[PDB]
Design a protein around this ligand. Structure first.
Ligand code: ICS
Ligand code: ICS
Ligand code: CLF
Ligand SMILES: [Fe+3]
Ligand SMILES: [Fe+3]
Lengths: 522, 475, 522, 472
């Protein structure tokens, strides 16, 4: 039944007695469901140390991973270039998923095409798909550039991207001067961030490799900035804002902030802003190149150093106080520009917030996960706040990265109870937050199912989730936030302290039971 | 508007294509004359590089048919991508304890690495099954959903399924739904249907222990999006029928095994489940009928048609249900129809809803001036021409460029489509409702769902945001 | 008992059994407490319509007001001027409260002195206090200016501020040329925003009245901006940022954003930034004067129109979409500068967010309270979002303001269930959220005791609080947020939508009970 | 120290005009471990940014506010009651709005009509409305704000008349902010109001079942639960705490106090007045104790037990032996992290000396302390606690406190909210010693663990090393 004056959606419609009795009859009559006491027994078992030890013995099964496949990052990299169409050579199902995944995180259109390789192509390659696909794409959507990656089926069969594209130009399907950079992005190697590195190195190769004779380091007096896989709009804007405040000439290579934030003014803009082909052609003339996320920009670093002859400085991701400081001092040394008073004052205002909030942050235990560069920056900032990052999980991390993070933890008393996990998924983390309960989780939307599970054991065992990372699907507009620089540190700080205070207010809201501590002033 | 105007609209849009693409797309764009094959073809390969909306066979098998089965564990066999982008993306609701006895919103995968590509993953799959049994003892079956590389590298998941299934006395279903197969999600439905037939549906061919009644039915092809199936089940059981099974929203493996015992199969989504419906009529003799629970007019029509398959007692309870909910949906129309009367709609969805929801819009005085399917067949378009008005635009496997150009000229009041289209038309200032996920609302089936549907169209179509697109100083 | 490994603060230390038995013995033994069944009986009575009728018949009793007294606003106004020391002529207790109040909201030092009038001053006046106070303040803290207000003591006894100050210079306690603007700020008239208006009109009086002969309207080609009582740092910065983007010369009269946000860099800065005396002197030469909060700048408006001869435009506070547009168009008309593409794009991005979130905001019912200008702008924006402002409370609003808000409500279908209340306090609102339950509250920290009251009736009756306004004492750094312009609308929108989504997640978190609707994607 | 502190005092006073110079000189002194060296309880010099509050704060916010089952009317304009709503963490147990009202703000909200015609007619109406909307209140107090005395209202007659009409305890308090020089006179006025209107309600009553171990906690306002962490120790020692003045206190507990055998005074400054009265009228002796830190707590338990018989003195040593391993573990953990660190304090009337022992229990040294509104007898008790060559200040000004800190450079400062953010920006760890920085409790053994944890987390926090940018 429905009352027209107060219509009920699925929740709480199906809580009505007639629906509740109906679901009970379906269960008892035909579902052949395990009895409830057996379900509770098994659930309680999955929260124990015994289950965790079996859980960590896995080596063939992955449950709730915290990573995606390469071509997803290759798409995000391509979208950062002006009038550029991402183009995934292979099966069209992947592109439907790529667009939907980004659609839901940014809540914006995401343009990407496929050449729709099918069963027949599995036997004789997708050369014809490339010829017709490139010509159809250029004619229909009028891009200035097409950046080609690959799905896993095209990688298994062994399609030669270089040859197929050259034949498309040779046979007259697209003009020979039309830029078509390419990169092999195998889903069964690395993760989405590896796909970002591969796509970017491919685009850099395309525009510089053969034209290195007339280049000389530093002639354009700019600094190249390579962001890497970055899903926060504010992180692109804060980097450009700080360098502009310093008067530093810079070149952001792959800049999707405009195309992922077009205005709703009556017209759909498929393309917007982005790095120009001219900026890529001229990049070798920069003073140097800074890699914002070096732990998944390995391939790009080798090319920038090997071919452009730039001496990429050893810099951590500019997150937190120390690493933002070092980033600015290195930019100052390279450009010859002093750090302006405005950034000095902004730094002091972040420190002021740290002093004002340090009593609520001290000792708070956190589990967290994400991509390698983002995680260690988050770990670094937590230690600076006096927090304990007890559970550090990076599904797509490697041994060399874990060694670095372990050194960061050892250099602080707040890293004493911390452990770094690589190759583990969110079902591994579920066990960790049960057997070694932290105070909060910091992670993407998939963590909400770990919070649900902890609450089922008990209110005193619930581990609330703080959404910082990718993807974020169940809140709106957090993709506009910032995590880099002093600005990002202030936003993270504010989110952490107020999550602690919100949780405290809830636990002290019971009248005449716990509301003695329901303070007005905190 | 007029028939010639829309035909000339088609011609102008196709002018941008190369010759080859132009000649193919012309066969997929037509104006309705209410013999579908006589004016539009479908179920063809997508032209490369035109930004199709379609997915793959894995999506049609894993995401649509098998995924919703709650007490089974479904393995995304291959690299890590497919299972992650499809995790909890579809709102096929269910009752259960996730991680203990239900697993719908979880992502199980073999996470293929390079060593698995060059030496196969059959040994890894056997290990994976053993690990599943250890950590999820209450699972009542396992399905292995094949991703693209599995078929290309020559793996034999059927041999693993049979060996491990006998070793553990377990139902293990191999599904060769690799994404390169077929042309869309459509073939994934068929592949999944054949997997149910060959590995599950016959498990109780010999058993007679289930007590049958003359009013046993089965809901086939309702995936309980936002509770759609629960809103449909309650009506059928108020009519005096006993719903034995739900395929596959909130469906359990036992419900599937009991389906050959029912007296009538009620098929909602023809496209995705007609294969198994025709099988059950040949092997078990169970007849099936299509029905439509979108809107009061269709719901009432379907209840009466279903009740006519039984005796006078069900027909009597049928009119009781119709009389009970009559004041409810009449109040909905009285409130919302004057707010939506005359508004024009364009639809682009998958394989059923582009026609099934027309009656619901017409129950609110709205007109569907254009509809289309991602992956329907000719038999779906046959059924569409009776529903759509005359001189309305039909498009098969529409391209991103075509859809935008059609909207620019037709200028509908509302667009109902998918997430990959939503934010495009919102920026153009056209109200948009997601017609796959219900925009995280619903249910829309049945009488209770119609109230939500009308509330949802109205809140979006008449929202104050749509008048503010233009800044006052740029006019 | 305490375990040194995990020390417990008041919560949950006092939930230990031994503390529990102790407090039970204290109650049953010596408190003579009413029976719990009677306490429950009376509580449920306070939630009824019958109690609400009794509650609204109050003439003399005020319970939990939503306003402060005048000199609080006079202090905040004076803080906005360069090297200006606020100075409250009266008793010192008021200044102790003024500083602590702002201390807890801004989490920053707040400088303000008092001349500490005692019992004898009540009989003979506070002239001697003024003489020594002005000399002592000037010498010890070395300000460039001293803005004088009054406490209710000095107002009752009728101390003539102009005479006392003139006698202080006449007797040589302070130099003649030392600026000492003044204003009478009676605590028993109006509220804190009236103190802001009085203090500002007094400062403009001191620097312009005796020198209008040489002023020419529009000669400096600037626009004066008077912000009024404003406790969000982001609101000062968004006005300056939008006017700088427009290329509009402007003068922000009273600008405390610097002194209320000094960096923590090893030294304390009593003064910082602020409106310079020169800017006040030259203000009559502006093209016009814009009042950002016209409903508590009544006195200032009459002075600027009658003395400066400025045709102050009739503009609402620039909150929401429509009133930010009108603000920018009027600024464009006055200055001759066109609205740039950057602000046009920002507007379109706000519209995009509104279209992205409208399905979750639609029909949501809100109770809200605060100051008049802030309240009406929040009501306007809620109507734009498709929400229903059911209970609109403004303790310090007047008859004319309520008529203006009723006109705004009548011009929209989303305000047909709305009611504007003036002269009512938060004990009135408590009844409204019980008898006519909204979905959320939007208000300051004092609303947390209403949420606690609603929860005690039951989880189904709980009305969550959304902290927007002044003062906010139980969250950190919300005073940095923005509520004006497109930027502020974007922040408010985000806070509202994610508050709705947080509450939905909590109600659907129960496993096998309501988690069928615990969607990953929303 | 020594002559360095004397030259510091003089250098700082050189900024003042002559008149203020001569007055402030009397309120600054170097300890030689009170009259003889420092003056106190004098008016504040105008315009020097003192930290003191007013008599209203001392009566409404401090003494009367915490009484939970009474309703306290802020009589006057709207300001005072609003700025003091829920600002002080005098914790309590109850149902707020039904049978407890501490964190609520009741006010008469004076308008000009009331300033001209008087508020006596409005107060009588206000009381009738309180009775209908809050029927479970067990008393009403009227806290006067500045205008009440200046306009000529007679709240006392309003109290008597209404009190008899409704058979309710109505307590008029003339705590107008212009009275006195600080919060101190508010204490006295509030104590006298308790005497004249509440304390003698059960003088004829003999029904209370008394025991020889009955005591009252006088002068503990349960900041963060301080009084609860004190009561538990006393009752473990075998005593019965009949009353707590006034943290989590009820009006019936106050009426029962004249029935106890001993008054345990924690805050001498605020409650010595009523304590001296109960000794004269009812013959109840009173004694001062100190539950800050294990050293002071053990000594106090032993001195209290000595006032009773063998069994109480036996239970005392059992309590001491019970908590010994707990506070020894606290010292073993936190003293090495705080040893040798120097502290400066500035609080109200009790804590600037009462917490010294706790800091010393952690190996810390208080190099300077001072009060806002203490009297001569407070500095008498202070000079024995403080060490030689330590700085003492009375009613310190914002300028003096800033200059003293810049020269002494303590490792930790403990003061109020109006001082907190000044010194944090200077890079000096700060702990609120009024509100416990929203932590605590700090009394008793359970409170010492929290105190030690709080001092360590702040003093050794990593934020203090980042004040200076690596590029200056
Ligand atoms: S199964 Fe099919 S695309 Fe029939 S693949 Fe698709 S939950 Fe659509 S039009 Mo998403 S043939 Fe169902 C469908 Fe219809 S996923 Fe849902 S909405 S009624
Ligand atoms: S009552 Fe006094 S100022 Fe003795 S007015 Fe003040 S809760 Fe202080 S040093 Mo705030 S004489 Fe209590 C005090 Fe001490 S408010 Fe508290 S901390 S022990
Ligand atoms: S068409 Fe379909 S969704 Fe595509 S891959 Fe093929 S089954 Fe799967 Fe999967 S992992 Fe990534 S997203 Fe592709 S490239 Fe390999
Ligand atoms: Fe968007
Ligand atoms: Fe601060």
């Amino acid at each position: 039944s429905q009352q027209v004056d107060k219509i009920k959606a699925s929740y709480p419609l199906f809580l009505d007695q007639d629906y509740k009795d109906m679901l009970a009859k379906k269960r008892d009559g035909f579902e052949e469901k395990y009895p409830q006491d057996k379900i509770d027994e098994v659930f309680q078992w999955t929260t124990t140390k015994e289950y965790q030890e079996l859980n960590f013995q896995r080596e063939a099964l992955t449950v709730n991973p915290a990573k995606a496949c390469q071509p997803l990052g290759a798409v995000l990299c391509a979208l950062g270039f002006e009038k550029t169409m991402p183009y995934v050579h292979g099966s069209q199902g992947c592109v439907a998923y790529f667009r939907s995944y980004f659609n839901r995180h940014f809540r914006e259109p995401v343009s990407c095409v496929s050449d729709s390789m099918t069963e027949d192509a599995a036997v004789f390659g997708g050369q014809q798909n490339m010829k017709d696909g490139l010509q159809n794409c250029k004619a229909t959507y009028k891009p200035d550039m097409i950046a080609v990656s690959t799905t896993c089926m095209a990688e298994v069969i062994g399609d030669d991207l270089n040859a197929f594209i050259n034949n498309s130009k040779k046979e007259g399907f697209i003009p020979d001067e039309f830029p078509v950079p390419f990169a092999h992005t195998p889903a069964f190697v690395g993760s989405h961030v590896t796909g970002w590195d591969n796509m970017f190195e491919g685009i850099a190769r395309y525009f510089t490799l053969k034209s290195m004779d007339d280049k000389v380091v530093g002639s354009n007096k700019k600094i190249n900035i390579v962001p890497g896989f970055e899903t926060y709009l504010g992180n692109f804007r804060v980097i450009k804002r700080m360098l502009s405040e310093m008067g530093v000439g810079y070149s952001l290579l792959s800049d999707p902030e405009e195309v992922l934030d077009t205005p709703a003014d009556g017209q759909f803009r498929m393309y917007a802003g982005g790095t120009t082909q001219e900026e890529m052609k001229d990049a070798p003339n920069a003073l140097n190149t800074v890699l914002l996320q070096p732990w998944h920009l390995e391939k790009t670093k080798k090319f920038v150093e090997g071919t452009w002859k730039h001496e990429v400085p050893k810099l951590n991701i500019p997150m937190g106080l120390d690493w933002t400081d070092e980033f600015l001092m290195k930019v100052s040394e390279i450009s010859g520009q002093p750090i302006p008073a405005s950034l000095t004052k902004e730094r002091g205002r972040l420190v002021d917030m740290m002093t004002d909030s340090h009593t609520w942050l001290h000792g708070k235990r956190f589990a967290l996960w994400g991509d390698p560069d983002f995680v260690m920056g988050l770990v670094k900032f937590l230690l600076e706040l006096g927090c304990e990052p007890v559970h550090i999980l990076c599904h797509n991390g490697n041994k060399r990265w874990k060694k670095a993070v372990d050194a960061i933890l050892a250099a602080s008393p707040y890293g004493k109870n911390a452990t770094v996990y690589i190759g583990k998924d969110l079902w591994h983390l579920r066990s960790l937050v049960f057997t070694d309960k932290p105070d909060f989780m910091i992670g993407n939307s998939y963590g909400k199912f770990i919070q649900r599970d902890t609450l089922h054991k008990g209110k005193e065992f619930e581990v609330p989730l703080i959404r910082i990372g990718f993807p974020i699907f169940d809140r709106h507009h957090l993709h506009r936030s910032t995590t880099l620089g002093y600005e990002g540190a202030m936003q993270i700080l504010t989110t952490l302290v107020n999550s602690i205070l919100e949780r405290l207010d809830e636990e002290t809201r019971g009248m005449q039971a716990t509301d003695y501590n329901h303070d007005l002033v905190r | 508007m007029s028939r010639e105007e829309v035909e000339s609209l088609i011609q102008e849009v196709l002018e941008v294509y190369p010759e080859k693409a132009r000649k193919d797309r012309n066969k997929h764009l037509a104006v309705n004359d209410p013999q579908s094959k006589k004016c539009i073809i479908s179920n063809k390969k997508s032209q490369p590089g035109l930004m199709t909306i379609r997915g793959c066979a894995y999506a049609g098998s894993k995401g649509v048919v098998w995924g919703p089965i709650k007490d089974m564990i479904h393995i995304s066999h291959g690299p890590v991508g497919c299972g992650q982008y499809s995790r909890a993306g579809r709102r096929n609701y269910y009752i259960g304890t996730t991680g203990v006895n239900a697993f719908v919103t979880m992502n199980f995968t073999s996470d293929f690495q390079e060593k698995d590509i060059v030496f196969g993953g059959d040994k890894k799959l056997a290990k994976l099954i053993d690990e599943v049994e250890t950590l999820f003892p209450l699972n009542k079956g396992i399905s292995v959903q094949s991703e693209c590389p599995i078929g290309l590298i020559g793996d034999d998941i059927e041999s693993v399924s049979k060996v491990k299934g006998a070793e553990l006395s377990k139902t293990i279903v191999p599904v060769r739904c690799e994404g390169f197969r077929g042309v869309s999600q459509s073939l994934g439905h068929h592949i999944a249907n054949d997997a149910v037939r060959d590995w599950v549906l016959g498990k109780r061919d010999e058993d007679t222990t289930f007590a049958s009644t003359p009013y046993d039915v089965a809901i086939i092809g309702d995936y309980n999006i936002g509770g759609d199936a629960w809103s449909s089940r309650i009506l059928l059981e108020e009519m005096g029928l006993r719903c034995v099974a739900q395929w596959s929203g909130d469906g359990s493996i036992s419900e599937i095994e009991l389906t050959p015992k029912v007296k009538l199969n009620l098929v909602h989504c023809y496209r995705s489940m007609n294969y198994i419906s025709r099988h059950m009529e040949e092997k078990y003799g169970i007849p099936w009928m299509e029905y439509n629970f979108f809107g009061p007019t269709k719901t009432i029509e379907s209840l009466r048609a279903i009740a006519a398959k039984f005796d006078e007692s069900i027909q009597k309870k049928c009119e009781e249900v119709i009389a009970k909910y009559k004041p409810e949906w009449e109040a909905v129309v009285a409130k919302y129809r004057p707010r939506l009367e005359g508004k024009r709609v364009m639809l682009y969805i998958g394989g059923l809803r582009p026609r099934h929801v027309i009656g619901a819009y017409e129950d609110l005085g709205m007109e569907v001036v254009g509809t289309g399917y991602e992956f329907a067949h000719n038999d779906d378009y046959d059924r569409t021409m009776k529903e759509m008005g005359d001189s309305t635009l039909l498009y098969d496997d529409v391209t991103g460029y075509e859809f935008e150009e059609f909207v620019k000229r037709i200028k509908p009041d509302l667009i109902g489509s998918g997430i990959k289209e939503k934010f495009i038309f919102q920026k153009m200032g056209i109200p948009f409702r997601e017609m796959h996920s219900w925009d995280y609302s619903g249910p829309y089936h049945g009488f209770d769902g119609f109230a939500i549907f009308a509330r949802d169209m109205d809140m979006t179509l008449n929202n104050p945001c749509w008048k503010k697109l233009q800044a006052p100083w740029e006019a």
